[PDB]
Every structure is written in structure tokens, then in C-alpha cells.
Amino acid sequence: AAFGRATHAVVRALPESLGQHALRSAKGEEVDVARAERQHQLYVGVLGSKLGLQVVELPADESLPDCVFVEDVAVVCEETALITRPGAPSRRKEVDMMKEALEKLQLNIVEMKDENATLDGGDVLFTGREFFVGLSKRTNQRGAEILADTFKDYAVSTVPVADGLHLKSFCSMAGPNLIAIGSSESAQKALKIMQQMSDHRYDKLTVPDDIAANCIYLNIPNKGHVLLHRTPEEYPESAKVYEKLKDHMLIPVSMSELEKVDGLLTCCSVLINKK
Numbered sequence: 001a002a003f004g005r006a007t008h009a010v011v012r013a014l015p016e017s018l019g020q021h022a023l024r025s026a027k028g029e030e031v032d033v034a035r036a037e038r039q040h041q042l043y044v045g046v047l048g049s050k051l052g053l054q055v056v057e058l059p060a061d062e063s064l065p066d067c068v069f070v071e072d073v074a075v076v077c078e079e080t081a082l083i084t085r086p087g088a089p090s091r092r093k094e095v096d097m098m099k100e101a102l103e104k105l106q107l108n109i110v111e112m113k114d115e116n117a118t119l120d121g122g123d124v125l126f127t128g129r130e131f132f133v134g135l136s137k138r139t140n141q142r143g144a145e146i147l148a149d150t151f152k153d154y155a156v157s158t159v160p161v162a163d164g165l166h167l168k169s170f171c172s173m174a175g176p177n178l179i180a181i182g183s184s185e186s187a188q189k190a191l192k193i194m195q196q197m198s199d200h201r202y203d204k205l206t207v208p209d210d211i212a213a214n215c216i217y218l219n220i221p222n223k224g225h226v227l228l229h230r231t232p233e234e235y236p237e238s239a240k241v242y243e244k245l246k247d248h249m250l251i252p253v254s255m256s257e258l259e260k261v262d263g264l265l266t267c268c269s270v271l272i273n274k275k
């Protein structure tokens, strides 16, 4: 029941079509798909081999170039799973296989069915106490409404999100009551709004690089308060911030290839606590 506790991780393999056909917010260097597969493999390795989570590895689908980013199609709170209606029409079929796995994991399933609603899981920050939901190009008010009705035990508050960003493009939970936050103008504004709307203030962990504010926090029983963060090779000055968390078990993980298509750390997994 402690924050960050998980027993299962759902992930999904990369399709070869990702390199050229995955959606991306900015034009940049070419995706090395073979290398991206290696980085994804190490990522899965940490969750399953090193941390002992039961990993469900969904097969890839070439017709769904973004299928690896499973975070966007499912939001899990306790034993309830909200199957989303992704903002990008090209990603909507990714829902089909996620519904399968979560039904097998025997969770209480709720699917976003309103044809006027959109929501990317990447726009959702669950602090352990409430939800913050980015209103972006991908997530609308109606999407936020459905999330609120699904997790009625929790308060849900919206935060404006600019351009091709998601809420977690510049923030994530780094521990209980602790929000990892970028230092950009956008990130600070979003944080101020979050702090202003919440019932409580949150502690924060400020990092110089927005992207490196996206990390994975895991409470692993009899092992540690684990934090998966971007490497010192990717973001040296942010890694130095994480390194000061003496009580955390720090695991640097590279996502350099998938970053080219806006794929960060939280984006590649759905974490579940199954009793």
C-alpha cells in the first residue's frame, strides 16, 4: 500500500515501422531501430530481471508504429484500469491488446468510449494522493472528466500543456510526496498550477533538463526505493541531482533512440500492484 509499490509491469515490443512512421513532435536525427530494441531490452531487463517484477511483454504490431509506448493506452490505479482513447487516431488500435493483457491480469476494466473524449496516459500524473491531467493536443477536458469518474476516490485537476508536450514530458514522481520537475518556464508554470490546485503542497526535485524529470519510481519490497533515471551520458547535470538521493537505489537507464520519437522512461511501461 506504500506509494510506488508494484508487482507487474506491462511492456510492448517495438515494431520495425517505428523508425520511420512513429509520431514525433520535432524533426531530428534518424531512429536506429536495432539499437532502440537493445535499449528497450535493457529497460525490460531492469524491471523484470533486476527488480523482480512479473513482466508481460506484448508482441509488436507493424500497423501500430507507436505500440511500444503502452503508458498512453492504460492508466492503472490500484486494481482499476482505465483503457484510454488515445489522442492520435493512429494509436487507437493499441487499445485492443492492452485490454487483453489486463483482463488476463484480472483487473477491473473501464474503457473510454465517448467519441468526443481523448486522453493520453502520458498526460496523467498520479501522485499517490490525486491526479493531475494535462490538457494538450492529445488530451481534452472530456478525457479528464472520464478519468475523474473512473477514479472517484481521488481528486482530479487539469493543467494546460503546450505544443507537442505531455504532462510527463517534464515531470514525474520521484518518491512519496515528491515531484521531479524540469527547470524550464513551461515546467515551472505547470508545477505552480499543480501546487496551487492541490489540497497539499508537494516536495520537489528540480532538474536542469526537462526530459530528465521523467523517471520511474518503484518501491520494491526488501530491496529499495528504486529510481530509474536517464544516464550521465544523456543528461550529466540531471544525473547529478538524482545522485544526491542517498536513500534511493539509483539505476541509470538510456532512452536515447526512442527519445527521438518523444519516448521517455514512464512512457514504455504500465505498472500494476497485484495483491
Ligand SMILES: *CC(=N)NCCCC[C@H](N)C(=O)O
Pocket: 022, 023, 024, 025, 066, 069, 071, 072, 088, 091, 120, 121, 122, 123, 166, 168, 169, 261, 262, 263, 264, 265, 266, 267, 268
Ligand atoms: C511518457 C509518455 N507516455 N509520452 C507519450 C509519448 C508518445 C510518443 C509517441 N511517438 C506519440 O507521439 O504518441
